[PDB]
Design an enzyme around this catalytic site. Structure first.
Site, PDB file in Angstrom:
ATOM      1  N   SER I 119     139.442  64.103  78.080  1.00 48.02           N
ATOM      2  CA  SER I 119     138.098  64.490  77.757  1.00 48.02           C
ATOM      3  C   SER I 119     138.024  64.264  76.295  1.00 48.02           C
ATOM      4  O   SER I 119     138.859  64.769  75.553  1.00 48.02           O
ATOM      5  N   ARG I 120     137.035  63.482  75.837  1.00 47.09           N
ATOM      6  CA  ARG I 120     136.949  63.131  74.451  1.00 47.09           C
ATOM      7  C   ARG I 120     136.011  64.044  73.734  1.00 47.09           C
ATOM      8  O   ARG I 120     135.946  63.988  72.514  1.00 47.09           O
TER       9      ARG I 120
END
Lengths: 116, 253, 169, 120, 265, 48, 120, 116, 168, 85
Positions: I119-120
């Site tokens: 998850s950025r």
């Protein structure tokens, strides 16, 4: 699960996991051997090998391709017969009696055949 | 050899050495060297020019330059034009040498030119006449006969393998044309052998009647010996006997 | 190759590695199929070669395991030993096919484990000699095998005895 | 000096007074002793360093006063309190064992071992 | 294709790396326990040796050897086999008792007259007195150990933490104990047959040490071997990675050319 | 019954009180097969 | 950037974000313009176009632009034509790593990955 | 067979088979140690390492470039030479001996050279 | 979606599956004879996907604080994440959830491969409560993955502790 | 199978073995054989006709050949005109 009924679902889910574990273990067994596979793993290999070959069933049109009379099991019967195997109720039966057989009743019959 | 194993430096040293006979008075000793720089940054070429003037070597060498900035058709014609510059020396009988750095980049230039002419793409997407392109350039290097003036034009073209694999369409086509290869190996370059001249893949198909008799006598069989060191250390990585150990000790030194 | 494979009713896949490896005709049994199958097999030859496919298939698996250098249990070494004999049985001298009537005995010998004893090097010798032996002694057997083209119980027993007689050599 | 080592332990591997039970009765070693080799029988052993005394139950082995005043004791297994009731139950089983069969000799050793344990 | 056949082969190579990594770690784990056992064993041995030394006991012929059932533990199996062969030249008539499947297989090949007694199942566990005793007891009964004028045990001494050198030592015969150069004020029992008993006692006590030295060398070798395996496998990963990368590039180019050719028409 | 066998049985008896660690119990476990050989030929393998 | 260098003399430093995406962007513009696609899929005009961008940044006798650019290797292959074409221009590489930052060290510059041309 | 003569064909068959085995075990040789090979195979690999080196032939026209003097070995001699090597007759001398030397006789002589 | 975003609601548009979107663009372009390109996918295919996926955004408080979460679904043909249509999309997106077939078979359904998902935008999301009591969860699973292959003997107590916690 | 695994020989054996029935008089057990050789060099084809004549099997075979010297149309037409035969 709803569609095929809860019993059918559970039995079949257990089959899938058992076979998939065996496939994963296949690499380890290949090089290292079964000489460091745990007691649980050894049981999983044995059960999986039995389940793996329980799949084969002689067919009616494979009486000219084989010659062992064809077999058609009922839906209910397949759920039951596999359920037994997974539970280990027939883990005392030799491996070749799962090859080209019908239901559980046939697995028992082939056990007798081998006994002779 | 492999990309940025400072390939140019191996050649650069050759240009530098010809000063202690090239500043002489014997005209059978001059080797006026032309350095063709194709596809290198204007900065990189300029640094090279300054390097040559630092070693006071500029005065014996010509530089033809067709930098990275310069448009693709100029780059394509860049080695050919340079080779013409070389030939005037050759046909006066004055021994000369031309180092074309890097012909691998000439290929990329020809690729652009060909594709933009809509000529159908070839193997590895390089022009179909790419074999012809390199061959016409390369084969103009020669040692003229006694009749024709005893000129020379020693050509050393520098090919940049991608990934350090000697098979590949652009590298192999060049390998086939040239006489011998002096392969440089990335592993050795990294592991502190500079110049990093792998002796496994360096051959000189041109005779050993190239180097002077003194350096033939003293260097007798050393090429063999260091391909015995190569063998010994290949299987060194079991039980080393004194014979292997003696060779290993010699080899290492 | 892909297009033709779909069109055709069988593959009799050959393999380069096996040609050098000693097999000849080099037919990689694993990749060869006959989808029209044993409906066209000679009736006799079907009986003798019944488990030949299975044995060979087992051999492939076992042999693979053996090359890792893994310890082999006795069941595995039965397969391995039997399998080796089969491979030598297959080989043939090119440009000299062998009559089907005299191929029914040879396969019988292999499948009924009579060649299990015979030493690996001389399997080929045994093959040559066996044919000579059958011509001499069991020439009745050969005529029948040709003539009736399906082995009867009596013929199978006769053949079984005959093969045994030559295991003595 | 005493060196007492076992195939799974190292105990005392000088030591003031040591009492060892051997096929010659009981032997005590203090300083130099005659540099005999004597086979140790299944045993209760006491090792004393100063006046402090530690008691070991010893499975028998061999004892050798070395001529340099090193008491090499080697035996298969042992403290005494740790060995110490269930074994008394075991001897009943062992008595049964004398009845059936090599087992007789085994059971005889078992009778010796319970007797020796009961002794201390 | 190229791409798929390359890709699957690289996956195989990767899996091989994973297994060799796993084994190497587990081997180290096993090794720590192995070493612990060997220390204790060696300490015990020195006490027995103290008698033999001070006594200065100075010795067909029996040869006993130690290797595990387990294979792939480097060259423990074959270095010992080689040293057995060396001393099998010396005495042609000696009876070799092989403790371990690996030494059994190799020795059986070099001369198939040697094998008289052999064991199987010793190798998978740490040395234990129980094992040594039982082997010893059987050695006396089956082989009639006292008859031989020489007993010799061969094993792999775990010389240094990365090496093992095959080594042998002589188990002194009961005759030897009797006539020992200094059998001075050693002994006092003229009743108990201290030579004939001490012989038996050191048959096992020496054998246990040999087995223990061996087990440690074996596990140490396996660690070393699996470590070198991991390295070799790494090199193969790198080499096939370059091949993979090239193959991938080539497929993209070759496919691209086909599309271009179509459009061009 | 060899001298070391004599000691062995005694040792086995000594692992009998019940307060004893697993490693003690492990040292009393064993698993081996003395496979007799002759000439080549192999008289049958049998547990110790 | 060039206005700064040329007309205000100062050395300046012009960052580019993914320069991979410069190449990638170029690849599309070629394809739309209808030029025949070239090796591995990149522009037929791949080399020169990288040249136009990467040779205007240079050290002039007035000032110098200097550019820190970020290269995102496609498919983690340094052999692909787009990284390769990029690598020719580069002079130093500072190779920030996530391992290094996880060892607490920040600046995250990996000490044994970074390499420079000028460092001779 | 029997175009080059039965004896020739036999020699050649074995040369190919031996070399093919050696190629087959190339994977195992790199991945695991060279001594982890099966004993039967280990002989084959050692024999083959010799056969491969034996295949050399110091070129007689590239003698200038190569350095080693030239060697041209008769065909009748060639069949004989390899026959022996396959039968292990001369397989007992260093592997390095086989590399870059002429006929079988030359290999023997080169053993003497190495021995010094 | 724009009506929701602009009017200041929140909304999530899940494009299922962009792999088939790609195929459709290919069909149009090739049939219109527009120049072909890599892997026979239309030339500007990166541009097409990028246009779609960037319409998602989180509007500023100036612009009414709307949102338009998006979740494209991409079908990986044989799990080859090097393929041209997946690779383009992977670059464009801002996160991945990588469902793995093996896990699916192994009864872990949802079959999120914990390792290969990222998850950025990460910690900006997650309910504050859930963040607190599951920072640990990320770390524990990481160890379980690493020590996974060691599950084939004589294993350290530490290794065994990890295994018990990890399996559970 | 891969090139130069003497692929032709596997087939050639079939042709040769058909000698056993062919020679006989049982008409409905005879298999005559047409070997069509497209793309092989004239010498190769010639070797084949020589082998077939040597083994005396060229008395029940038709060899339709279009060697690789011949025109591209004739080669294309060659299997289909063999098929008619």
């Amino acid at each position: 699960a709803a569609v095929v009924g809860q019993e059918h679902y559970d039995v079949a889910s257990k089959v899938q996991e058992t076979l998939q574990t065996y496939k994963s273990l296949q690499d380890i067994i290949a090089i290292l051997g079964m000489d460091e596979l745990s007691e649980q793993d050894k049981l999983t290999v044995e059960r999986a090998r039995k389940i793996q070959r329980f799949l084969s069933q002689p067919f009616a049109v494979a009486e000219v391709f084989t010659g062992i009379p064809g077999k058609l099991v009922r839906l209910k019967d397949t759920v039951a017969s596999f359920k037994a195997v997974l539970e280990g109720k027939y883990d005392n039966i030799p491996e070749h009696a799962f090859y080209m057989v019908g239901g559980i009743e046939d697995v028992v019959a082939k056990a007798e055949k081998l006994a002779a | 050899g492999d990309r940025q194993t400072g390939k140019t430096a191996v050649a650069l040293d050759t240009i530098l050495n010809q000063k202690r006979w090239n500043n002489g008075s014997d005209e059978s000793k001059k080797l006026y060297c032309v350095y063709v720089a194709v596809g290198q940054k204007r900065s990189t070429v300029a640094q090279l020019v300054q390097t040559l003037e630092q070693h006071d070597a500029m005065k014996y060498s010509i530089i033809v330059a067709a930098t990275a900035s310069e448009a693709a058709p100029l780059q394509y014609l860049a080695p050919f034009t340079a080779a013409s510059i070389g030939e005037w020396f050759r046909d006066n009988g004055k021994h000369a040498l031309i180092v074309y750095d890097d012909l691998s980049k000439q290929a990329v230039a020809y690729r652009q030119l060909s594709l933009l002419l809509r000529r159908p793409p070839g193997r590895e997407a390089y022009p179909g006449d790419v074999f012809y392109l390199h061959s016409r350039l390369l084969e103009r290097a020669a040692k003229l006969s006694e009749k024709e003036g005893s000129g020379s034009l020693t050509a050393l073209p520098v090919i940049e393998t991608q990934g350090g694999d000697v098979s590949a369409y652009i590298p192999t086509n060049v390998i086939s044309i040239t006489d011998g290869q002096i392969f440089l190996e990335a592993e050795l370059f990294y592991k502190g052998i500079r110049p990093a001249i792998n002796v496994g893949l360096s051959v000189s198909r041109v005779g050993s009647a190239a180097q002077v008799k003194a350096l033939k006598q003293v260097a007798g069989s050393l090429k063999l010996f260091l391909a015995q060191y190569r063998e010994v250390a290949a299987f060194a990585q079991s039980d080393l006997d004194a014979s292997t150990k003696q060779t290993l000790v010699r080899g290492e030194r | 190759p892909t297009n033709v494979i779909s069109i055709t009713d069988g593959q009799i896949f050959l393999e380069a590695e096996l040609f050098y490896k000693g097999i000849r005709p080099a037919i990689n049994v694993g990749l060869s199929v006959s989808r029209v199958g044993s409906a066209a097999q000679v009736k006799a030859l079907k009986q003798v070669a019944g488990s030949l496919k299975l044995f060979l298939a087992q051999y492939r698996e076992v042999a693979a395991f053996a090359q890792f250098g893994s310890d082999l249990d006795a069941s595995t070494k039965q397969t391995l030993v039997r399998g080796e004999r089969l491979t030598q049985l297959l080989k043939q001298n090119q440009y000299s096919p062998l009559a089907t009537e005299e191929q029914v005995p040879l396969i019988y010998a292999g499948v009924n484990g009579h060649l299990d004893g015979i030493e690996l090097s001389r399997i080929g010798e045994f093959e040559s000699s066996f044919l000579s032996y059958l011509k001499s002694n069991h020439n009745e057997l050969l005529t029948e095998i040709r003539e009736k083209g399906e082995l009867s119980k009596e013929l199978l027993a006769s053949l079984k005895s005959a093969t045994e007689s030559f295991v003595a050599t | 000096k005493l060196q007492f080592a076992l195939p799974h332990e190292t105990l005392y591997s000088e030591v003031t007074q040591v009492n060892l039970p051997a096929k010659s009765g009981r032997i005590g070693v203090l300083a130099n002793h005659v540099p005999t080799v004597e086979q140790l029988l299944p045993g209760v052993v006491e090792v004393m360093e100063g006046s402090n005394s530690k008691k070991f139950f010893i499975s028998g082995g061999f004892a050798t006063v070395q001529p340099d005043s090193q008491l090499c004791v080697t035996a298969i297994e042992a403290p005494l309190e740790s060995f110490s009731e269930n074994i008394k139950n075991l001897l009943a089983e062992a008595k049964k064992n004398v009845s059936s069969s090599r087992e007789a000799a085994e059971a005889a050793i078992q009778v010796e071992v319970l007797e020796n344990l009961q002794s201390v | 294709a190229t791409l798929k056949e390359v890709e699957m082969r690289l996956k195989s190579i990767k899996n091989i790396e994973k297994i060799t990594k796993t084994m190497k770690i587990v081997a180290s784990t096993r090794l720590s326990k192995a070493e612990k056992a060997k220390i204790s064993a060696k300490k015990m041995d020195e006490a027995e040796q103290l008698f033999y030394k001070n006594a200065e006991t100075k010795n067909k012929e029996l040869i006993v050897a130690i290797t595990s059932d387990k294979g792939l533990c480097g060259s423990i199996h074959s270095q010992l086999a080689k040293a057995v062969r060396r001393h099998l030249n010396d005495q042609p008539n000696a009876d070799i008792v092989t403790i371990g499947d690996k030494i059994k297989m190799q020795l059986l090949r070099t001369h198939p007259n040697n094998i008289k007694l052999s064991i199987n199942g010793i190798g998978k566990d740490a040395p234990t007195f129980q094992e040594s005793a039982l082997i010893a007891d059987k050695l006396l009964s089956v082989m009639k150990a006292g008859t031989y004028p020489k007993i010799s045990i061969f094993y792999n001494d775990p010389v240094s933490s990365l090496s093992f050198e095959p080594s042998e030592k002589p188990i002194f015969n009961a005759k030897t104990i009797e006539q020992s150069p200094s059998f001075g004020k050693f002994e006092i029992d003229t009743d108990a047959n201290v030579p004939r008993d001490l012989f038996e006692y050191t048959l096992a006590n020496q054998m246990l040490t040999a087995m223990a030295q061996g087990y440690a060398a074996e596990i140490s070798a396996r660690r070393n071997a699996m470590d070198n395996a991991s390295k070799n496998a790494g090199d193969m990963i790198n080499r096939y990675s370059i091949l993979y990368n090239r193959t991938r590039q080539a497929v993209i180019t070759n496919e691209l050319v086909d599309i271009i050719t179509g459009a061009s028409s | 019954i060899s001298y070391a066998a004599y000691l062995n049985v005694a040792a086995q008896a000594i692992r009998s009180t019940e307060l004893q660690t697993a490693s003690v119990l492990n040292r009393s476990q064993t698993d081996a097969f003395y496979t007799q050989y002759k000439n080549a030929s192999e008289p049958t393998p049998i547990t110790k | 950037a060039e206005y700064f260098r040329d007309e205000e003399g100062q050395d300046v430093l012009l960052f580019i974000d993914n320069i991979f995406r410069f190449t990638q962007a170029g690849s599309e513009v070629s394809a739309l313009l209808g030029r025949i696609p070239s090796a591995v899929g990149y522009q037929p005009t791949l080399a020169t176009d990288m040249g136009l961008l990467q040779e205007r940044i240079t050290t002039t006798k007035k000032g110098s632009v200097t550019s820190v650019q970020a290269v995102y290797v496609p498919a983690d292959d340094l052999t692909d034509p787009a990284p390769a074409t990029t690598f020719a221009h580069l002079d130093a590489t500072t190779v920030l790593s996530r391992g290094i930052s996880e060892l607490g060290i920040y600046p995250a510059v990996d000490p044994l990955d970074s390499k420079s041309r000028l460092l001779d």
